[PDB]
Write a protein that holds these residues in place. Structure first.
Motif: not given
Ligand code: NA
Ligand code: NA
Ligand code: NA
Length: 111
Positions: A87-100
């Motif tokens: 199971l992988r827990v990750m942010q959306t690419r949009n939020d990841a790009r913003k370093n949220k």
């Protein structure tokens, strides 16, 4: 980076709870071994943290988030094979790009 955890249920129980915090493109992984036909249900407190599962007999991955069409009426997914799942827990690419960041609590149930 992200953390990699082996899911270890208390003996005789069918769930465990974890907490984490992901930053940017990091993802946390929760690994377990299970038998074909066992049912998985994952709930997460922060719906901004995606939850996808990888493993044998799964082409690509499967979305296990609460509104996913991959789930049945009880919010469960039937494992298609026996072996090691992730199971992988990750942010959306949009939020990841913003370093949220996303703080989250995840409940992993396998029956
Ligand atoms: Na990985
Ligand atoms: Na759950
Ligand atoms: Na996105």
């Amino acid at each position: 980076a992200g953390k990699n955890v082996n899911v270890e249920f208390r003996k005789g129980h069918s769930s465990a709870q974890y907490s984490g915090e992901i930053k940017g493109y990091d993802y946390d992984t929760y690994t377990f071994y299970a038998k074909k036909g066992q049912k998985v249900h994952v709930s997460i407190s922060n719906e901004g943290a995606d939850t996808y599962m990888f493993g044998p007999g799964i082409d690509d991955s499967v979305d296990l988030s609460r509104y996913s069409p991959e789930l049945d009426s009880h919010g469960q997914y039937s494992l298609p094979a026996s072996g090691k799942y992730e199971l992988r827990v990750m942010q959306t690419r949009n939020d990841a790009r913003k370093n949220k960041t996303k703080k989250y609590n995840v409940d992993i149930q396998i029956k």
